[PDB]
């Protein structure tokens, strides 16, 4: 709705810093609304559900189980590591893993995920395989927050990221049984309360995955809708401001209401 995107050119200005927005359908897959779709962003943890996207796919394939365990060390455990660092004993199942790394954000569960599939440029060759040559993550947690500005490293678009993650929660290419497993876990995020769910009408699915990174990153990929169902993708990504947290919170929030009362 065009009020929508007054309300992203609203949070460009009042963060100082550019913000990308795309709106897609998700049965049809067409775009409803856009906005910078052709620019770069850091993806920040964001990746994480392509990450667990790879990773379904090669569980699919049989070259990954669910249920495999993995055990690592003291020195594998980088910042924010809030899952990772309470089983250092008794290693974690790559289902285990999977969900930290979603619903939680941890760095070292989305590092030791990276390993399995074989790091950063195997993503980008998995992504690159089901038709996005757009996106690319290139370092690990967690210097791949950065964000630099002009560098693409660790970047996508708005309308790259939209579609990619339409395809692997609706399209071909995961078994019915992973692209249910990979929503449920952004169903079940716990670190994106106040941003589209503040937003979010009593009786609405979401399922979804924010990000944060250095220089003003923040970001949020989402599958909602009304009626306990998701029907529309959303995404939203801004880096470049020095606003504090709170108040890009509070923008994506924002976009988030107009989205909700023009649907
Ligand atoms: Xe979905
Ligand atoms: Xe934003
Ligand atoms: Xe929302």
Same mark, same amino acid.
């Given at each position: 709705?065009?009020?929508?995107? @007054? ?70 455990? @980088? ?14 199942? @790559? ?95 716990? @670190? ?72």
């Amino acid at each position: 709705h065009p009020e929508t995107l @007054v309300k992203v050119k609203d949070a460009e200005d009042q963060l100082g810093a550019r913000v990308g927005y795309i709106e897609l359908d998700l049965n049809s897959g067409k775009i409803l609304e856009s906005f910078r779709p052709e620019e770069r962003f850091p993806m920040m943890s964001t990746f994480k559900v392509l990450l667990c996207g790879a990773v379904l796919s090669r569980v699919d394939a049989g070259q990954e189980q669910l249920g495999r365990r993995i055990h690592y060390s003291q020195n594998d455990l @980088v910042e924010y590591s809030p899952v990772t660092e309470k089983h250092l004993t008794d290693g974690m199942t @790559v289902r285990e893993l999977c969900s930290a790394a979603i619903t939680m954000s941890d760095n070292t569960a989305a590092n030791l995920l990276l390993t399995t599939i074989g790091g950063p440029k195997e993503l980008t060759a998995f992504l690159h395989n089901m038709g996005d040559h757009v996106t690319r993550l290139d370092r690990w947690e967690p210097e791949l927050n950065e964000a630099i500005p002009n560098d693409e490293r660790d970047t996508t678009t708005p309308a790259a990221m939209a579609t990619t993650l339409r395809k692997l929660l609706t399209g071909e290419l995961l078994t019915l049984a992973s692209r249910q497993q990979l929503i449920d876990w952004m169903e079940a995020d716990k @670190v994106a309360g106040p941003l589209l769910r503040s937003a979010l009408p009593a009786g609405w699915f979401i399922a979804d995955k924010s990000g944060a990174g250095e220089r003003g990153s923040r970001g949020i990929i989402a599958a909602l809708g009304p009626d306990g169902k998701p029907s529309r993708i959303v995404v939203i990504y801004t880096t470049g401001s020095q606003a504090t947290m709170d108040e890009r919170n509070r923008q994506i929030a924002e976009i988030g209401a107009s989205l909700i009362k023009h649907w």
